[PDB]
Each structure stands twice: as C-alpha cells, then as structure tokens.
Amino acid sequence: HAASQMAKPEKRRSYRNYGLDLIRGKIVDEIHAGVLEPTISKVKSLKSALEACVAILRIDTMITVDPE
Amino acid sequence: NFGSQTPTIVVLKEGTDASQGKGQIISNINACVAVQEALKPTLGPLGSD
Amino acid sequence: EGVQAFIWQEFASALEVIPTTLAENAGLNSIKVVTELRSKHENGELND
Amino acid sequence: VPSNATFKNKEKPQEVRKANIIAARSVADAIRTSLGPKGMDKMI
Amino acid sequence: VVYGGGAAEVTMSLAVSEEADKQRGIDQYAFRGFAQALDTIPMTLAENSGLDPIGTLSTLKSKQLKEKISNIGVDCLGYGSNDMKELFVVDPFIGKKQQILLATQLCRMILKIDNVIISGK
C-alpha cells in the first residue's frame, strides 16, 4: 500500500487490491481469491461509526438521576 | 462411593481469583496508569500537590 | 460620585465572564486576550 | 461615633443570601463549560 | 515599633498597588489581590463598630496619597483624632510582620493542593 501511492503512472501498476489470507498466512490478490465486498458497505459504515464517536467525545459531564 | 453427592474436586482452594483469558495482563497496565494519573500533575516546578 | 457608582464598577467586570469563558474553553490565556481586547475596543467602536 | 444610631440584628439573612449566591454560582460553573463554539454537550 | 488601628495595613496596601502599574505583565493581577486583602482588616474593624467600610477605607486611602503620614487609621472607640500618635495605640512590628508571613506562606501551600484523599473515620 505504501508503494501503491508511489506506484506512479506508466497495467503494470498492481500494488493494490491485496489482503491477508489467514488460512495460508500469505498476502495474495483478493480478486483471484474470490473475496469482494460492496462499496456502499464502506460508506455507510465509516459514517455511522464516526457519529458514535463524535457524540461521546462531546460529553463533558454525565449526570445520573436516581429513580423515584 | 461414600455418598450420593460425590463432590467435584476443585484444583485450587475456594476464594482464588482467575487468570489467562483475554485482558489479564492488561489489568496490570491500567493499574499502573491510574497511579500515574496522580503523579503527572505533580511534575514540574509549576506542578501541584 | 456615589455608592451606586461603585456597584456599576462590578457590573462592568461581571460581563467579562463571557469573553473569559471563550478563551478558557479554547485553551488560550484569558488575560492575554483581554489585554488585547481593551486596547482594540478603545479605538474600534464595534465588531472587535 | 460608634455605640450610636442602630445596631444590626438577626444577621442570618446575611448568611442566607451568601448561601443562595454560592449555590447559584455552583450551578453556573457546570453550564459555563458549554458556552461558545468550544462548549461541550451535557449528557443527563 | 508600629502603630495599630488599621494604619499598618492601609500603608502597606497602597505600596503594593503602585508596583502593579509598573510591572504589568501576568503578575499585575497578583499585586491587586494582595492589596485588596490587606484592606480587609480595616474594613472588618468598621463592621464590628457599625461603620461604613467603604467610606472608612476611602478616607484612609485618600489620606496617604495627600500626605505621607502613615499614622491615620480606623478608630473603633470613636474618640476622634484618627492620628495614632494622639491615641497612643502602639503595636510591635514583629507581630505585624509575622501576620503577613504566616498568611502568605500558608496560602502558597493551600493553592498547590490538587488531589484530596480523605479516609473515612
């Protein structure tokens, strides 16, 4: 990935779409491995996970009222 | 055979804590950081008591 | 020239809590800002 | 100059007014941190 | 030797407030807090005597600026003649010097206290 940004134009690029294979313990192409995930799943996940962290970082004081 | 109860033998005496799992060594880290929390403001000539 | 005038001196200083709170919540020093606030607001009539 | 005019009695209201100001300023200190764009939310 | 009746605290109060204008900086507000603290003793004497602490302190401050005589102070007995020389009131200097040292050095330790751990009885 660090060499993917510096891979530079000229497909011969490569350096991208690589991931961890936990069974064989090697780094192989995920396209040939048959592992794909929808793009919209990454957009809705990062936006929903951020709103949970934003609301927590903004709480200075917690007030708990005992039930009557 | 001396009774229908037949208790199960426990390796350690009752009252002994547990260990291993996940986070047992992490419990020792948070104990030192919490003690460090009090000594951090006391550092420096402008520090507190 | 009266005891009511001495109370008004504390009334003006009581309103300084709003600009002081803005500096404390932002991490900046309050006195260093107010020192610049008093000098700039003397010539400038507003928007400072 | 002293010993004349009047002497202040029942000074408890002087303490009651102080107890009301101190208790009111204590509430204003928690909300003070929420003032301005740098303020923080209060979860209750 | 010093003269009591609140004349010592007023004399030392205006000397500190004058230095605050020359120093300025971040410590300018520090000398103001120490000058207003010395005036509390003369103002306290006016409370027990049923006087006005504002009118009494304003007279003492205006007297030290007009004339250099430091012997003018609060009179709780109401015999007149605010000059301590005619009223004979005299205090030791070693007694008044310790009042400032014991008060200043104790507040220096109190302001440094942050975490307070108090065990249950």
Curated annotation (Swiss-Prot), chain A:
Superkingdom, according to UniProt?
A: Eukaryota
User: What does the record list as coiled-coil region(s)?
Assistant: none
What are the subcellular locations of this protein? Cytoplasm
The family classification in the record reads: Belongs to the TCP-1 chaperonin family.
- Oligomeric form and interacting partners: Heterooligomeric complex of about 850 to 900 kDa that forms two stacked rings, 12 to 16 nm in diameter.
| Purpose of the protein | Molecular chaperone; assists the folding of proteins upon ATP hydrolysis. Known to play a role, in vitro, in the folding of actin and tubulin. In yeast may play a role in mitotic spindle formation.
Please state what the protein is called: T-complex protein 1 subunit alpha
* Species this protein is from: Saccharomyces cerevisiae (strain ATCC 204508 / S288c) (Baker's yeast)
- Location of this fragment in the whole protein: 481 to 550 of 559
From Swiss-Prot, chain B:
The domain of life is: Eukaryota
Q: Where in the cell is it found?
A: Cytoplasm
Function per UniProt: Molecular chaperone; assists the folding of proteins upon ATP hydrolysis. Known to play a role, in vitro, in the folding of actin and tubulin. In yeast may play a role in mitotic spindle formation.
Q: How does it assemble?
A: Heterooligomeric complex of about 850 to 900 kDa that forms two stacked rings, 12 to 16 nm in diameter.
Q: Which family does it belong to?
A: Belongs to the TCP-1 chaperonin family.
| Protein name per UniProt | T-complex protein 1 subunit eta
Species source reads Saccharomyces cerevisiae (strain ATCC 204508 / S288c)
Q: Which residues of the full protein are shown?
A: 2 to 50 of 550
UniProtKB/Swiss-Prot annotation, chain C:
Q: Which residues of the full protein are shown?
A: 433 to 480 of 528
What is the protein's quaternary organization?
Heterooligomeric complex of about 850 to 900 kDa that forms two stacked rings, 12 to 16 nm in diameter.
Give the gene that encodes this protein.
CCT4
High-level lineage: Eukaryota, Fungi, Dikarya, Ascomycota, Saccharomycotina
Q: What does this protein do?
A: Molecular chaperone; assists the folding of proteins upon ATP hydrolysis. Known to play a role, in vitro, in the folding of actin and tubulin. In yeast may play a role in mitotic spindle formation.
Q: What is its subcellular localisation?
A: Cytoplasm
Tell me what else is known.
Present with 5530 molecules/cell in log phase SD medium.
Task: Give TM segment ranges.
Answer: none
- Disulphide bridges in this chain? none
| Highest taxon of source | Eukaryota
Q: What is this protein called?
A: T-complex protein 1 subunit delta
The family classification in the record reads:
Belongs to the TCP-1 chaperonin family.
From Swiss-Prot, chain E:
Parts of the chain that traverse the membrane: none
Which compartment or compartments is the protein found in? Cytoplasm
Assembly and partners are described as: Heterooligomeric complex of about 850 to 900 kDa that forms two stacked rings, 12 to 16 nm in diameter.
The Swiss-Prot or TrEMBL record describes its family as follows: Belongs to the TCP-1 chaperonin family.
Record's function text: Molecular chaperone; assists the folding of proteins upon ATP hydrolysis. Known to play a role, in vitro, in the folding of actin and tubulin. In yeast may play a role in mitotic spindle formation.
- What is the name listed in the Swiss-Prot or TrEMBL entry for this protein? T-complex protein 1 subunit epsilon
Organism for this UniProt entry: Saccharomyces cerevisiae (strain ATCC 204508 / S288c) (Baker's yeast)
The beginning of the lineage is: Eukaryota, Fungi, Dikarya, Ascomycota, Saccharomycotina
Which residues of the parent chain are present? 439 to 559 of 562
